Design a protein around this ligand. Sequence first.
Ligand code: 0QS
Length: 330
Amino acid sequence: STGSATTTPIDSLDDAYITPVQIGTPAQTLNLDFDTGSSDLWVFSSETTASEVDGQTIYTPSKSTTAKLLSGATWSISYGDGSSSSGDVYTDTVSVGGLTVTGQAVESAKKVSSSFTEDSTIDGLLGLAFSTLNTVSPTQXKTFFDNAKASLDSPVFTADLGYHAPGTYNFGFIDTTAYTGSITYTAVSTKQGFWEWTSTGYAVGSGTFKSTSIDGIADTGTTLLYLPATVVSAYWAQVSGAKSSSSVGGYVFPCSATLPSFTFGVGSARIVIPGDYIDFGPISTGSSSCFGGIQSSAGIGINIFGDVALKAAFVVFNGATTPTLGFASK
Ligand SMILES: CC(C)(C)S(=O)(=O)N[C@@H](Cc1ccccc1)C(=O)N[C@@H](Cc1c[nH]c[nH+]1)C(=O)N[C@@H](CC1CCCCC1)C(O)(O)C(F)(F)C(=O)NCCN1CCOCC1
């Protein structure tokens, strides 16, 4: 089997991407944030405290004929930006781009944090990291991808994120029309549960590629590109108007700049982000100062290849028993 689904920037910044998923019988369609940096399918639901729901679409399990209470199971999660939700656990039929899974764990929020309430466009999260990161106890869990793997034509899914446009998530096959050149594969480490890989260095603009190991995770659920302090400082030192803002919290530059490209290595291969990907947006509507799309990871503890990198590439998540990561240019 295979599936395919249009994914959609939630705003004009590419702050995040949402994807329609059908849950239950007759399907309820919810707009979920596909997140390869966590492994919980959690939704807004009829169980959510009401003063905490705010425009979102909700999952009603009682209205689905195929929902079953997962007795005794609860979950709690918190993300890197400090937001959080908890509640209890159903299994139910879940469908993504015509790819259907049964007795998939759907995690039902009883409470959500403020950031989630205030975010009207995202109805919940589909976690696509490894299943060890799943928060449901007493037994975790296991993601959509894992549940699907047995029926997939290939134990694989691809991320095709568009710049200021729609894109594609595919499961079970690889679309050869979707990129240019060949995929280079790199080794994954599942030690921390992440899509964790090691970049072989970087170049800024037209200058020299520098061979240095950059350990980092590929993370569709993170907006920006976070790199070590000395790599990021080396980029922004090419942009004449760029300074680090304490108040705004990272590198800003004049919106009028033309930014240099940034190349990261994958094995012997190179992936170039266009300078335009890295102009993130004005810090206020009508500002002359913009917020940069590459920031320091020093406060975070790990490097994140997030949306700014990934939407520059056709990215292949190969979940064979030894997982690897694929990059093509597009
Ligand atoms: C607007 C912004 C200034 C650019 S922002 O940084 O707030 N963007 C958010 C994403 C977002 C999209 C749309 C609307 C609102 C917010 C963002 O980048 N969130 C990061 C926070 C971060 C990391 N570094 C610096 N900041 C995050 O938590 N991302 C997780 C997925 C997100 C969570 C918020 C909702 C959208 C999905 C994540 O899973 O990808 C993660 F990897 F970052 C993460 O925190 N994974 C948590 C891993 N858990 C830990 C507990 O054990 C199990 C595993």
